[PDB]
């Protein structure tokens, strides 16, 4: 590999540099406009997400088939963690794009979405209480990529250990005692279980919206969604 011989600062440097940009909405609400805006954005972010993933150390070392599988498993968790991250400094709101801040009130508009909006807002608030940092965030999202589909399968689990080592290095650099370090490592990784939950509930609502055919979906989004069932 190569990911395994990077130092901790180099690993975080790599992940900071791979980071995708914050995109803007094609914006100039109801069920159709909500879903049309959101799925257009999701489609656009997905293309950037795919090129981000190839820049995650250790990722390109996998076979194309394993890369496909990990991205199909995790793409919604990754869009969600990004959304919740963007939204931190905007309490009670979700920043889908800098020109598209949405209240839970607009989540009502779509059938079944207010439940997901509330879970996302909770996650964001939780990230805020914990004072989550950017360096930690990029580690978490890389962890999601490598971990989420990893069971349907060593190098990859060694890569995950390298990222753990990296998170700990960031917290120690930031001054935390050893005990604050393992407690905070635990708090962060537990949040990934809730991000998983949100992704599964979101995927189910995406399929439901696919079926109700309220909005046409991009072929890419259809294939990302299809891979889940």
């Amino acid at each position: 590999s190569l990911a395994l011989s990077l130092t901790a600062d180099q690993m975080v440097s790599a992940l900071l540099d791979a980071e995708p940009p914050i995109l803007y909405s094609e914006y100039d609400f109801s069920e159709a406009s909500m879903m049309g805006l959101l799925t257009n954005l999701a489609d656009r972010e997905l293309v950037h997400m795919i090129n981000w993933a190839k820049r995650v150390p250790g990722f390109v070392d996998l076979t194309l088939h394993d890369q496909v599988h990990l991205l199909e498993c995790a793409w919604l968790e990754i869009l969600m963690i990004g959304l919740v991250w963007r939204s931190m400094e905007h309490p009670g709101k979700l920043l889908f794009a800098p020109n598209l801040l949405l209240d839970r009130n607009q989540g009502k508009c779509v059938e079944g979405m207010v439940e997901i909006f509330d879970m996302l807002l909770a996650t964001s608030s939780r990230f805020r209480m914990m004072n989550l940092q950017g360096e930690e965030f990029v580690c978490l999202k890389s962890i999601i990529l490598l971990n989420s589909g990893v069971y349907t399968f060593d190098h990859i689990h060694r890569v995950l250990d390298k990222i753990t080592d990296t998170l700990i290095h960031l917290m120690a650099k930031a001054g935390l005692t050893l005990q604050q370090q393992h407690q905070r490592l635990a708090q962060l990784l537990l949040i990934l279980s809730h991000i998983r939950h949100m992704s599964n509930k979101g995927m189910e609502h995406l399929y439901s919206m696919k079926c109700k055919n309220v909005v046409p979906l991009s072929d890419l989004l259809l294939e990302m969604l299809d891979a889940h069932r």
């Binding site: 293309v47 795919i50 993933a53 890369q67 496909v68 991205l71 072929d219 890419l220 294939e223 990302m224």
Partner: peptide, 10 residues
């Protein structure tokens, strides 16, 4: 012929 298969290659 998955789109993702192409986009991971480009």
């Amino acid at each position: 012929h998955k789109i993702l298969h192409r986009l991971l290659q480009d």
